[PDB]
Amino acid sequence: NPSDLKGPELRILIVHARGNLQAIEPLVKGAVETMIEKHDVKLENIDIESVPGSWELPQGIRASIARNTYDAVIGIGVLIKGSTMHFEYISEAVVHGLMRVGLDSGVPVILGLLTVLNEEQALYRAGLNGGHNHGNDWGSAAVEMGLKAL
Amino acid sequence: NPSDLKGPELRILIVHARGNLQAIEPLVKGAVETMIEKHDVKLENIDIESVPGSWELPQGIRASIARNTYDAVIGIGVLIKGSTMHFEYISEAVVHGLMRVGLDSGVPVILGLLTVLNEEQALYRAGLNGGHNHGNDWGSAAVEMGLKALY
Amino acid sequence: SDLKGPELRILIVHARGNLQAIEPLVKGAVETMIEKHDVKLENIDIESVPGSWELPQGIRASIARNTYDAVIGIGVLIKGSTMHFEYISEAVVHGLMRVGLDSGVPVILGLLTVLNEEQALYRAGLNGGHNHGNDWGSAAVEMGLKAL
Amino acid sequence: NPSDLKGPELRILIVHARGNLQAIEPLVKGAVETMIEKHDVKLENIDIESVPGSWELPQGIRASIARNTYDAVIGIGVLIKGSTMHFEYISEAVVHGLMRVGLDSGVPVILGLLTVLNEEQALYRAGLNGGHNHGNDWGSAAVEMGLKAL
Amino acid sequence: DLKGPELRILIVHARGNLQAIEPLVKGAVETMIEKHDVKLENIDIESVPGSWELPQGIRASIARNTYDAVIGIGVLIKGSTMHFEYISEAVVHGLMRVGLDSGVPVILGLLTVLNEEQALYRAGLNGGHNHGNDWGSAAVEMGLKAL
Q1: DSSP character for B98?
Q2: Number of Cβ pairs closer than 8 Å across B and C?
Q3: In CATH, what number does B1-151 get?
Q4: Domain E1-147 is of which CATH architecture?
Q5: 3-state class percentages of chain C: helix first, strand second, coil last, to nearest 5
Q6: Chain B residue with minimal CA distance to A96?
Q7: Which E residues in the span 14-43 are in contact with A, Cβ-Cβ below 8 Å?
Q8: How far apart are CA E118 and CA E23, in angstroms?
Q9: CA angle centred on C43, ends C42 and C44, rounded to 5°
Q10: How many whole angstroms separate alpha carbon B126 and alpha carbon B30?
C-alpha cells in the first residue's frame, strides 16, 4: 500500500461522455483537482477529451492513445438505467471495451463509468448531496497505475 | 457545440437490419437527415446497406469497412424482446460484435441498436408518438466520431 | 426475395440435439435456398456436430478446409433445470459471432434458445408456426452475395 | 446422424478440476469408458490431467495442447451455485475460456462443465440416482470431433 | 506434497476492503512457503488501487518479470448500483484473458460477495476458511504444471 504518490511528469488522458453532464462535470473536476493538488500532476499534462456517449468511450480512448502517449487514461461516463434493456447491454459492452483497450494497449485505463439506477445515485457518487466524489479516487488510481507502468 | 460540427468530407456507412421496418425507416432517415442538414455531410458520401437481421450487423459492417473506407459507421437494428431467450443472447452478442468491429478496425461504430421490450418503445425511440428520434443522435455521434478519428 | 445465388457454396452445420426441431429447420433452409434462391443442391454442404457447443468449432474447422460463401449454424437449446442453458447459449452465440468475424465468412445464427420444446417446434414451422430455417436460408444467400 | 464412430488412433486429453470429486470421478470414468468401449479409443491414448478448480481448466488445457498433440480435449469441472456471486462469474468466464481455447487452437474442446444449483443436480448428471452420465456424451462428442478434425 | 522451491510467484492485490485482503494475501503466502517450500524471496507482492486494475497490473508485471504463476486478489462487495455486476464480470474475464494470452497461470483470488461478512468469512475470519490458502496452493500447482 503506497501513500504519497507524485507524478509531476505523468501524462494523463481523461475521456468523458457528455450524457448526464450534471454528474460528469464534478467527476472530471474531482479527478483533475485530485491529480493536480494531491499528486502534483501538471495541469498541462492532463488532456481532457469528450465523446457523445458512453458507448464511444472505448473507441475515443483507443483513438487518442494511438495518437499521443499517455501514462494512464480515465474513461468517465454515467449510464442510468432507463425503460429498455439499453442500459444493461451497453454497460456491459462499454466496461468490456474499456478493459480490452487497456489490455490491448498496455496503457492503464481507469474505469470512471457510473452504472446507476437513477440520477440521484450518480449525483451522490459525483460528490453531491453528501456523497463522495469518485472522480477523486479515479484520479489517484490513474496516477498510481501510471507510475507503476514506469 | 455538436451542432457546429461539420463533416462535408466524411464518408459514413449506415448498415441497418430489416426486421421491424416501421421503426428502422425513421431511424435511418433521422440519422441521414441529421448528418446532411445539421452537419453538412454529403448525401453521396453516405452509403446505406442492409442486412436481414441485427445478427448480421457486425459482419455486414466488417465486410463493408474492409471493402471501402469510412470515417464512421452506424449499425442500426431493432431487437424486441420475444417469448424466447433469443432477444437476450443476440442483443448481447450483437452489441459486443459491434464494439469489437469498431475496436478491431479503428473505425468508429455508433450503436444504433434498439433493445426494447415492445414495439411501442421502439417506435417511440424512432421519434413516433411523441418520442425523440434516436437516429438523429446517432447521426451526430457518427459525425463527431468520424471527425475525431481523422483529427 | 429476388436474390439468386446459383454459384454460392453454402455450409450448414447443425447440432443433433432435438432432431424433431433440427430436421425441419435444416430442410427449410435448404429448400428455401434451392427453390427460392437458385442455390444448387450440390453446392450445399451439410455437416453435423453432436451438440450446440460444437457448432463454433465445427464451423471454424470446415471453413478452414473448404471455401463457403456463407454458413448457417443450426442448433436447438432448451432451457433445462440447471444453468447449463444460460452459459452455453451465451458462449455458443458468442462463438458463432466470433468465427464469422474472425474468418470473414458470414455465419447465420440458426440457434434456437427456447424455454421448452413447444417453442422450438413452433419456430421450426410446426403447429402453425413459421419455419425460421427459411429465413436463415435467405439470410445466408443474401450475406453470401454481399460478401461478393 | 453418424452410426458407429471409431477412433483407435485418436489421442484424447481429459483435464478435470478437483472440486466436487464425488461428481467429477464418475464423469471422467463415463467419458473414458465410453471412448474405449464404444469408440475403440485406446486407454494409453487418453491422457488425464487435473487442475485444482474449474477456473484453471482453460489454462490447464491451453498448456497441455501446447505440449502434446491431441485430437480432442474434454474439460471437466463442476460448479455449484454458492452463497456469493462467485458461481455466476466464474461459470461464465470458464465456459468462455474453454470455447476460446478450442477456437484459438483448432483443437476440439468438449465442454464437460456442470453448472448446477446444488450437488444433487451434479450427481444426477454424473449418472447417479437414476441420472444419465453426461461424461458418456462428452466422450462420444470428443471422438466424433476428433475424427472430423482429420 | 507439491513443492516449488524454485517457483517465482506474483501476487497482485487491490486495496479495497483491506480487512479482507490482508488475511487473503497472508494466507496465500504462508501456504506457499510453509506447505509448498516456495521461497520468500521468490514471492513478489504488488498492489493496485482496485479490482478493476488487477488485470492490467498483472499484465504489466508479467511483461517485466518472469513468473511461474500469478494470484490476483481483490474483494468486490455488491453495492447500491450495478457497478458490482459489471466490474466483477469484466475483471474476471480480464484475468482469464491475461492468463490465456500470456501463458502464465493466473489464479483467481477475487471475492464477489453480497456483503462484507461474506468476504471476511472467506478470508478465514469468524469461523470461515481462508481462501487465500487455496489460491496459494493452486498457484504452486499450476506453476509446476507449466514446467
Answers
A1: H
A2: 75
A3: 3.40.50.960
A4: 3-Layer(aba) Sandwich (3.40)
A5: 55, 20, 30
A6: B96
A7: 15, 18
A8: 14
A9: 95
A10: 8
Per-residue three-class SS string for chain E: CCCCCCCCEEEEECCCCHHHHHHHHHHHHHHHHHHHCCCHHHEEEEECCCHHHHHHHHHHHHHHCCCCEEEEEEEEECCCCCHHHHHHHHHHHHHHHHHHHHCCCEEEEEEEECCHHHHHHCECCCCCCEHHHHHHHHHHHHHHHCC
Residues 6+ apart with CB under 8 A from D130: D124
- Identify residues after which chain B is interrupted (C–N over 2.5 A): none
3-class state of residue D150 by DSSP: coil
Q: CA-CA distance, E12 to E14, in Å (whole number)?
A: 7
Angle at which helices D86-105 and C84-103 cross, to 10°: 30
Q: In whole angstroms, give the CA distance from residue B13 to residue B5.
A: 18
Fold assignment, A1-150: Rossmann fold (3.40.50)
Is C14 strand, coil or helix?
strand
Got the DSSP string for A124-145? HHBT-TT--BHHHHHHHHHHHH
Handedness of CA E135, E140, E143, E147 (dihedral sign): negative
- The DSSP result for C86-132, as a single string, is HHHHHHHHHHHHHHHHHH-S-EEEEEEEESSHHHHHHHBT-TT--BH
Chain C: give the shortest CA distance to residue D121, in Å.
8
Rounded-to-integer distance, Cα E33 and Cα E25, Å = 12
List the single residue in C16, C57, C90 with the smallest CB-CB distance to D145. Answer: C57
CA distance D22 to D122: 9
**Cβ–Cβ under 8 Å, residues A115 and A79:** yes
B25 vs C67: CA distance, rounded Å: 35
Of E13, E83, E93, E129, the catalytic one is E83
Grid coordinates representing A72 are 494512464
Q: Is A92 on the interface with B (CB under 8 A)?
A: yes
C-alpha dist (Å) from residue D12 to D6, D8, D108, D147, E33: 13, 11, 10, 11, 35
Indicate the length of chain C as a whole number. 148
Cα–Cα distances (Å) from B48 to A57, A88, B13, B16, B84, in that order, read 25, 28, 6, 8, 31
| Pair B55, B86: CB distance under 8 Å | no
- C1-148 to CATH, choices 3.20.20.60, 3.20.19.10, 3.40.30.10, 3.40.50.960: 3.40.50.960
Q: How far is CA D32 from the centre of its chain?
A: 10
Half-sphere exposure of B144 (CA within 13 A, CB side): 24
**∠ Cα D112 C86 B115 (to 5°):** 150
Query: From the CA atom positions of chain C, what is the Rg in Å?
Result: 14
Edge-to-edge strands, sheet with D109-116: D46-50, D12-16, D72-80, D109-116
Which segments within A4-129 are labelled E, that is strand? 12-17, 46-51, 72-80, 109-116
What method did the depositors use to determine the structure? Answer: X-ray
Is the CA virtual torsion C55, C58, C62, C63 positive or negative? positive
- Using CB atoms within 10 Å of the CB of residue B42, give its burial: 0 to 12 exposed, 13 to 18 middle, 19+ buried: middle
The three cell numbers of residue B41 are 455531410
Name subunits touching A (3+ CB pairs < 8 A).
B, E
- Residue for cell digits 487497456? A102
| The three three-digit cell numbers of residue E36, written as one number | 509448498
Task: Give the CA angle between residues B85, C108, C102 to the nearest 5°.
Answer: 105
Q: Find all residues with CB under 8 Å of C133, minimum gap 6, and list them.
A: C24, C25, C26, C27, C28, C29, C30, C32, C74, C110, C124, C125
The ranges assigned to domains in chain E are 1-147
In angstroms, this model's resolution equals 2.0
The C-alpha cell at E95 is: 484475468
Indicate yes or no: CB of E88 within 8 angstroms of CB of D85. Answer: yes
